[PDB]
């Protein structure tokens, strides 16, 4: 009967692994019934598109739309157009956005949308055509107040732009209903900052956590592993604070400076080697450039992290697992202290559950925070969150006041997972309070309260 | 055939009385046909319920509806749970919550429903039934613009929380119906404080004016009379202002310190004879304890009005006329600079007939200024209206924005009140702005004012 | 704490004493807890109708909407304006629905609405002003699926299509919400008639029933009691069939031929006194008439049914009790063999009480058919139903068409009667298929059954 | 098969005239197709009224919706009473509307409301029963997503809050979106106020701008020539800022002091002068005062800007080109620093063709800076957005809130508008940012932009 969705049953074994792991799944066996009201996406909904392409055919494709979190607000989701979308992946990035979400704290609709329509290699007026027979059918399973689609990285603002053309166009509803629009139209600052701000944020929250605010991005290295976008704001955010950005490991490997302890990276470097790596020229020769040469000694085939040095900050984004069991010790011997992954799941699950037996010997800054990216990740769609205040204002804010907004909800975010983590998944002493399990408490005892005070399971 | 709804009934009585007597009318005549047009509540709803008890069976309640202003906000009324509420107490709060949201200024649609929803002897199997055959039968009549229920004792968390559930299971339209949510499905802060609060600040405000600053709720014997949720809101603003609280109406009775004038009601004792009322936990118990029984003088009988002494600030809290006999002239010599009537319509129109002629005879202060039972802080609707305007900006406050928005409430109510009595009541030189007769005053001027302004009345 | 509505009280005490008396109460141990569920408010939408006059002032005439179930079909409940109508008589009217067209059993349940208006021959711009604001505060509670409304006492056809083109010039949608229609916009062919249609109708199907055909209403002795347009329709199908109309009863006074045992009443007569009694001038003239007088025997205040004569099939439509025990046995002996009514039981309880002494030895023909109300002018409503059907189709049928739609209609609800009265109250080989408990009977059966397969109470 | 739109057909040749003529159009040929797809409105709609006046009769009436611009918000419009508005008007409104709408930044749906409906000789009554039966046909094709009807001069607050009352009477559903409300009830502040404000913030950003900050309305001459509350509020901003307005351009003529070079009018002085003009008394008594002819020397039939002397701002208001041709250059040897059409395109192409190389030649203040019409000021939409928001969010905000966010709006206008004409338009070396080829750029720039990321066509 139950179909197989592979990354989903993965999403699912690691939640349950984790959470009976944790000491609160052990002193409150009434959550043993919460998972089958939560585990269940509260709607997947798809849709057969069928779509003449500029030269003039036939295309029936299916679009995406998932909802995994009620308890919060409307119904919500960011798209992501990629051939790789389908029901698996679909219900894996809801059944992790239901714990990156009701983290947030703020009133959102945890899930993501998506389609299989392809972003490169059709013609913009198939995009259109596409776009219009797509909110032909997905309008009557959305609205402001029930389900608000939104966009992300992979989906462009054209494909949005089209989509709710169609829908205003439709229902004569110039309403938000597709949230991540245009600046023109309705959209929001930072949009394309959040990714990039909010992970620097969380990073800068749990080591200040640790070490009372003496040291958050003063100057320590920053490998940001994330050259493009993510870097282009996470490292303007840290040079901001004042951490010295050290690394990256582009996708055609770790690139890096001189040697991490000794030098660091200019975010100019950064720029220009992400420019690159979207742009034809040359990769190669953008490592093998006059600065990317003799200041930095680039490395496409060794991390600067099992190079040990004085690396703290990690994100292997663009590279999904770069780093492996090769590097076990060093990468934490290194100085880590703290792993992200802006890439969903951007590091396989080893390097995670491994250096559980160090975190006994190694004190909060000391144990590493291999918290995925997904406390970190909320940025991102924390800002969706805020675009739809602004389509409920009626009213843009200014830079500063989205800044702020991001803020606090990293504040929310980091504080939620610690402090629950620290009493129900029993954070160990002298050590960081519970961070892989901080995952696990912190989603049990969101769902459970959610689900008990809202009547979702009784 | 009018059947009359004797609490209705004598809420009209008293407003028509204490009105077309008043002179408002006598100025202008068109008041007159006005009052037919208030008379009629905007809107009313009554719905049955076909649930069941755990053990299972055909358990029919009714709910409720009240809705008696259409003109400031959508139809915002507050539920109430108790076996008490058939429909004369309905309609009563209405005629009351017309001078209610109608002073509160905020665009509130004045209105108070609730159900007869036995609260004690029903668990959560029969919470859940009952108010989930709640929203099959409200759901229609209700949502935003149209109508926006609420919560009180009885309706407190479980079952809001659970009329909220099936709605948004019903309709797929995660909002802001349910006014009055809790933190995370949507809620508000200072939501619990709400009435305890503003009405420090509201009687602050009040002999404020009467002092032009001086007293203003600061140092004064406060006879809060409310030890429970309410003085664990007013006793806190109260000290945070500089009253002092002195006194308590328990269910044991009026019960006192040494001196209503000299020892003053430490808050440790209003929160925990607090704990001691809402709880059956003896009321004697605390009141003997020994450093309780020495600084207080438990004299349930005996009440800071008779007492007399120089307590000056009296409040006569939900215990039915709690204003003593001898209050008329004991409190006013005891020099409160203000009375109010806490307990709704509680002493007799003889026993606040005193201060009619303080007004004009004492001065500010020294006319004890008493506070209409109906003038007073809209805390409960005012802090419902504030998470109203949370939930449709999709984005919650803090709890300082929340109080600062009670205080705008209270002013709104202070001077609507004063301002209008000044106008039309026409207080002697002297004369306080007309109170009692003010607050009828102010209330039917801004009815008839809108009314003819927006074509309600013509 | 209900508010016993006096007339709504008194008809459900009735009902519920004829069916917790009767067998059925036992044949089924869950009838004891349907009556809890059948009779109680699900839906009572209180609303204002505040409209204006020729001299131009605010009428804030009450006008609510009650609704009990919707088990068999939508609530179609035919409005009132009624002079003095209140939630008492209001809910009657609802209850009376629910059992009528229980026993109909076509499209119709409880559901109820309308204000306190008084026709009282306001100008026809005040009718216009008043049907616009009623419609505009109407058209939420109603529609073609949720609630389509008629009008009874207080609404002709002139407030019925003021409503209606309200309500179509309001929410544009030309649907068959306004029930009763005219034959320009959708009316019917047996509209205004039937009522008398049924009630002949049902008399015949009886007497055919008893005397295995036979005797059909050809040659009998009738006292149709309703000249206006009661008998208008009824002696007009009672001279089709063959049946001779005998008397007359008015609110002036009932009338007679030379006597009702003597001679038969004639149509033209019948026709003549139903003109006057429509018209402006009262009925005295047409009684007064010389040559009616005369020949027809004409003594208002007597009623024939003292004078007894040997009429059967008697209607006392505008007599409301004006016999008793005065003819007890007399009308027996005369060969009534049946009684009902053209208006919803006119007749006070006085000898339906009674008869119980003929009833213990009256059998089948001998047995009196004390057709209910209910079971006797079901055609209104049947036409109403045949109407909603005509404007689901879109088109105009004719009027033999909707003729045997009635006629079906009649047979079924006569043929339920008598079916459930047997199967319960099961009649000791005697007295007609228990007449007088068949009410009972076929109430109670019909309601627990739907209400056991719809599972609205469980 | 365009019918005849003589101001709209004159609005659009004007519009493409100044489109294709400025390097917008040259330097970017391919956006010669954004005016076929803009040039038809949105969705301009109209409903037919059938009201009675107080005596009685039918009269039927038409009411007008017109949106040009629905790619930045929700359709919206400001009532306008007058027999002179038709279709012809409506779309040339609307036409001109787009632009400065479309500069306002705020998401508005660009457009005009309006009516027929006589202003001069109906009262409350004749005006409630047109405003009962105004939404009664335009409920439908409104609402807060779809359209949002606005009010302005003509219809004043008495005939849009019977409107609103009427729709909020009919879909039972506040949300007040009417637009102009009155603020007793979902009302704004400066609303009134907004068109003067606006036009002294655009008039003060365009003078700093010129002087590169030197002087803005610090004294200079300006010659608001709006007596009416125009200049009542306009006047006002301006010696709150620091200018001196010296002339008035009633109905009478270009009222003006003793010299337009020293003397200044004062707007307490100008308001007595509005009340003069408002009332139907010869303003020939106001200016004949011992204050106002002595010390002002009034030449209602010459133009100040004529006089010259020192006159540097001005508004050739409603009355269309009250200023001169023969003013010339004279005007720049007065210091104008500023021309203005406060009227609907009032002077001739040469009057303000003029300056042409002003904009250039005469660099820096000395540029006599002409404001567009169109430009001038978005206060009055600017402050419906506005109250927009106050709606939505449910929470009215402070006046001083609101002057700010409308500061912003006119600065947002203003950089639009001086932005686009140095890019898009051909603005030579500092040319006054192509004040009249300015207009042009902008709108053109904008449509084609939000045209293309909003995907409505290719």
Chains 1, 2, 3, 4 share one sequence.
Not at 57 to 76: D, H, I, M
Request: glycine share 10%; net charge negative; aromatic share 8%.
């Amino acid at each position: 009967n139950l179909p197989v969705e592979p990354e989903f049953e993965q999403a699912y074994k690691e939640l349950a692994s984790t959470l009976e792991n944790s000491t609160l799944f052990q002193k409150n066996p009434e959550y043993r019934k919460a998972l089958a009201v939560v585990s269940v996406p509260e709607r997947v909904i798809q849709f057969r598109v069928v779509w003449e392409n500029d030269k003039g055919e036939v295309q029936v494709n299916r679009g995406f739309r998932v909802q995994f979190n009620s308890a919060l607000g409307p119904y919500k989701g960011g798209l992501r157009f990629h051939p790789s979308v389908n029901l698996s992946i679909l219900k894996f990035l809801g059944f992790e956005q239901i714990f990156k979400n009701a983290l947030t704290g703020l009133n959102m609709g945890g899930g993501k949308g998506g389609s299989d329509f392809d972003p490169k290699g059709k013609s913009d007026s198939e995009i259109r055509r596409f776009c219009v027979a797509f909110m032909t059918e997905l309008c009557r399973h959305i609205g402001a107040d029930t389900d608000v689609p939104a966009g992300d990285i992979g989906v462009t603002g054209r494909e949005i732009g089209y989509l709710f053309g169609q829908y205003r166009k439709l229902r004569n509803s110039w309403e938000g209903v597709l949230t991540g629009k245009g600046g023109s139209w309705g959209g929001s600052l930072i949009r394309p900052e959040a990714t990039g701000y909010g992970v620097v944020y969380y990073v800068e929250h749990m080591i200040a956590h640790a070490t009372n605010g003496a040291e958050s991005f003063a100057g320590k290295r920053v490998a940001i592993s994330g050259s493009g976008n993510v870097a282009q704001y996470a490292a303007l955010k840290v040079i901001e604070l004042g951490g010295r950005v050290v690394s990256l490991s582009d996708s055609q490997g770790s690139l890096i400076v001189k040697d991490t302890a000794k030098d660091s990276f200019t975010p100019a470097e950064i720029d220009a080697i992400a420019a690159l790596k979207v742009d034809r020229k040359q990769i190669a020769e953008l490592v093998t450039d006059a600065a990317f040469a003799d200041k930095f000694t680039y490395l496409p085939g060794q991390r600067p992290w099992v190079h040990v040095g004085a690396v703290d900050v990690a994100l292997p984004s663009a590279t999904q697992n770069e780093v492996s069991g090769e590097e076990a010790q060093a990468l934490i011997a290194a100085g880590c202290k703290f792993i992200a992954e802006g890439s969903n799941m951007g590091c396989t699950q080893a390097a995670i559950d491994a250096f559980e037996a160090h975190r006994e010997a190694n004190k909060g800054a000391a144990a590493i925070w291999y918290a995925p990216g997904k406390a970190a990740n909320a940025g991102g769609v924390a800002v969706s969150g805020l675009e739809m205040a602004q389509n409920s204002a009626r009213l843009s804010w200014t830079a500063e006041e989205v800044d702020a907004r991001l803020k606090d909800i990293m504040k929310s975010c980091f504080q939620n997972g610690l402090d629950t983590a620290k009493e129900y998944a029993t954070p160990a002493d002298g050590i960081l309070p519970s961070l892989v399990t901080g995952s696990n408490i912190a989603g049990f005892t969101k769902v459970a309260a959610a689900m008990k005070d809202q009547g979702d399971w009784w």
